[PDB]
Write a protein that binds this ligand. Structure first.
Ligand code: A1B0L
Ligand code: A1B0L
Lengths: 504, 494
């Protein structure tokens, strides 16, 4: 009937190993991975890469995901992957007792399955280009502790590929990647992107901690309020909102005597506007601090904070490899900055734009001009050409274009003591000297047609004195996207939220 | 009006007046300004001349032609003395400065004969000049002197209500203990992050706007997300597992979570900062448990060392006394069954053997176990493992040869839960089985389930209450003392 032959070969493909002491292959439960009633010294590819670029003397155990597997008759080639490390492993069954069933079982493993391999490492004449570990494991044993259960939504070979203008080049589009984000995050570049994101949080916090800041956590469930862009929730039959920013609370912390504070936390913004550059939820980096007599003391401090961030991102083996891996798939010129950061007034920036023919305004209607986002990018091109930098500062915005807490110039009330920082022509930071006089604050709140009653907890925090202070807010994802030159904010947010995407 | 003009005197030139309210712009000669933290750290050499120093007027007293000002900044105070010069108009202006005003004082530093017991800067300043850059506009809601005192529960004594403090949090936070508490909160965050980063973790940030609850829809806040039905995250549980499923191997998050518990208790809030860890293990999830244990031991060690942290803990204990937090060199680990049998042996519970795994230990019972283990093991810190499967969430992996027990754990400080975690189910078929066994909607969770379907590493994780860890470390009586602007069902403001 020739059916028994198929059922037997199926038992081979599904083989469960009951004793890794007496067998060389199979699916195995984690609790059975004991060799001689003892525990296995198990390596990952990261350790292997550091030591090699003792475990060359004899057989070792190594764990990883099956990135790729190529069957070639009596040979089979496995690429193992861990993070951004990979290594070719070789099963040569003319070297394993002509166990053809073991080869049948190995060839049948689906991509991404997790295996523990026992084998010998050695260096080959011509190492594989794709693998950054230049040794190979010769497989003595291979057991699968987790088998892929389902066809992948797309192949990693395709998702890892640079921009495709070539014949037969398959792209994986944004919607597909984000709907299958846990597969998309396995590309080398995406892995590197979020290691770099972590790296920015780390450098940010450590710089501020070294300058005597304390970290704060302030609430995101608010009771009142730019109400236009605020998500609403029912807070126990009370009318509540999600924080668009920790603004009010970080200031209240300075009014309490904390002197220097920072927060790393989500904020929530209901901008019904699908763009490549904003999200409805993002991680905000917030700083608030006192100054002595000049708010430029703090500006120059914020500036050296970003020069330190850029310097650390661009220094050392680890950060060098992460950036290179991103650039392999998403090429872009290295981010440039100067020893002295260029600073331009809003008024100077306009005149540069009028002078380069990018902007036309009647000599009356200059103060009221609200520079567009496209125009800010035109300004960046100009400053890149004339100052050879991707990073500069704009100060002294018109008070009418800034929020109500922004201190204006005493002797020129239409100008404010405010500032934006730019990376590749796009805003990464916004801040200002604060109004720290209760009566001025009350006046400016009235002058903005705002309800002082819904702000009195905040207003009242200024009524028992208030140090001179300033602050800024920073988009983490935006800093990472613009440092690397990526085309979309969704590339630097783990599970992006926009007005059409609530899932994953 | 003549005496009023002198009390409201605005100084238009600092070089030649010596007193008055002055704007920040009219303050150049620019001075070299000091704060009391720089003073304190350099003394406990600027003592050779007149220095400028800014601070708040913590206390002021007019001993005839003498004026005593206690200047305050953060945790540091120093006594400053005015004794006219014979410029009586200046003594009038100073004596009327309301408390909490911010002044720039210029003068000389001298060792005092009798060091003031109150000021931890055991020097004094002699005032050559004093200006007020910020004048208290309003009468405080209570006095800092009363806010700083230990609460004597007797008739007619001072007591600043919790409600009064929280309604006026920006004054409340100026007490020496409250400032110290939140410095210690930053310290925990720092020790936690740095320990993980040194162990090769990466920081992740995952969304708090969801289409489905992460810890059960009964206690989740509802949100209108552009005409979708949404919820606030109760924990990053689903996303931190997805990141392990994506290969990140070791992740942590420090981020708010939101829980709509309609109970007003002393130990829980509706918003708190969750410290979350998720990581792979090789063969045995106890590898990660021991690692979590060693993280907390490191935190306790670093919090308890000499220097700044001892000063901070000491400042807190001055107003809120409590014995130092203790832990052993080797942490005690009890199974859930053993913990229950300790409670039975001490007459706190009457349970037959076959009823033990069905008992769900209450908060009071856990405090009772805390007292038992404190008397017998001499520690404030222990671990319980092997909780009943039916009492833990659906992502908890059960013991294969003993399914009614799970591979789960809580950590405790002073008998109260600070951490909860478990080995995760890392098999997509077993996960679907457990989702159904817990009568849950696999369709709502599909994005999460699916992340296990292209292989899943053995992993575990845990979630930690930042505010509760600080509260229990210091022995404080209410979670609202370790959250800056606490949220409970009755308080949305500040
Ligand atoms: N929808 C968004 N999506 C993404 Cl991804 N990033 C966004 C979005 N919106 C903003 N950012 C980023 O956050 C930055 C700060 O925000 S802000 O509005 O300009 N001013 C602050 O709130 C203000 N309180 C700061 C202060 O004065 O201390 C900004 O520079 C961008 O980089
Ligand atoms: N209302 C509250 N207020 C305040 Cl202030 N703190 C609270 C509140 N609720 C809880 N905590 C604290 O957070 C801890 C973890 O929370 S959890 O529910 O037990 N388990 C996790 O969610 C689970 N996904 C973790 C995992 O398996 O990795 C807990 O130990 C407490 O310390």
């Amino acid at each position: 009937e020739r059916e028994n032959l198929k059922n037997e070969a199926t038992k081979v493909l599904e083989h469960v190993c009951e004793d890794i002491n007496k067998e060389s292959y199979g699916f195995v439960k984690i609790s059975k991975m004991k060799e001689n009633e003892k525990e296995i010294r198990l390596f990952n590819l990261e350790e292997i890469y550091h030591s090699l670029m003792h475990l060359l003397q004899s057989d070792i155990w190594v764990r990883g995901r099956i990135h790729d597997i190529r069957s070639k008759g009596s040979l089979a080639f496995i690429i193992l992957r861990h993070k951004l490390y990979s290594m070719q492993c070789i099963l040569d069954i003319k070297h394993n007792d002509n166990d053809k069933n073991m080869m049948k079982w190995v060839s049948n493993l689906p991509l991404e399955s997790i295996v523990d391999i026992k084998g010998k490492l050695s260096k080959p004449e011509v190492p594989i280009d794709s693998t950054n570990i230049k040794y190979e494991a010769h497989i003595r044993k291979i057991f699968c502790i987790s088998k892929t259960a389902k066809e992948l939504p797309f192949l990693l070979k395709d998702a890892n590929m640079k921009e495709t203008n070539e014949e037969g080049s398959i792209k994986v589009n944004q919607d597909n990647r984000l709907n299958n984000r846990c597969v998309d995050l396995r590309t080398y570049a995406n892995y590197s992107i979020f290691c770099l994101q972590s790296q920015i949080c780390t450098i940010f916090k450590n710089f501020l901690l070294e300058n005597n800041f304390i970290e704060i956590h302030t609430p995101k469930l608010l009771g009142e309020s730019g109400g236009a862009n605020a998500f609403q929730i029912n807070y126990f039959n009370q009318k509540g909102f999600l924080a668009q920013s920790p603004q009010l609370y970080k200031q209240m912390c300075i009014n309490s005597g904390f002197d220097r504070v920072f927060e790393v936390a989500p904020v929530f913004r209901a901008e019904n506007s699908n763009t490549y550059r904003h999200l409805c939820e993002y991680v905000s980096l917030d700083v608030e601090m006192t100054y002595k007599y000049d708010y430029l003391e703090n500006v120059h401090f914020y500036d050296s904070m970003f020069k330190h961030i850029f310097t650390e991102l661009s220094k050392g083996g680890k950060n060098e490899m992460l950036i290179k891996t991103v650039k392999g798939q998403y090429p872009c010129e290295d981010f440039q900055w100067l020893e002295e950061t260029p600073i331009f007034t809003y008024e100077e920036a306009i005149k540069m734009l009028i002078q380069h023919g990018k902007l036309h305004l009647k000599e009356e209607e200059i103060l009221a001009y609200d520079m567009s986002t496209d125009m800010e990018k035109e300004l960046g091109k100009i400053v890149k050409a004339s100052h050879h930098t991707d990073y500069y500062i704009i100060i002294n915005f018109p008070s009418a274009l800034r929020p109500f807490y922004t201190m204006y110039k005493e002797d020129e009330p239409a100008i404010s003591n405010s500032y934006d920082f730019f990376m590749r022509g796009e805003e990464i930071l916004s801040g200002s000297q604060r109004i720290s006089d209760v009566n001025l604050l009350l006046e400016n709140i009235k002058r903005f047609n705002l309800d002082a009653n819904k702000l009195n907890f905040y207003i009242d925090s200024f009524a028992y004195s208030s140090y001179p202070h300033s602050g800024c807010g920073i988009g983490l994802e935006r800093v990472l996207m613009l440092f690397l030159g990526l085309n979309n904010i969704r590339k630097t947010s783990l599970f992006p939220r926009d007005p059409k995407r609530l899932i994953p």
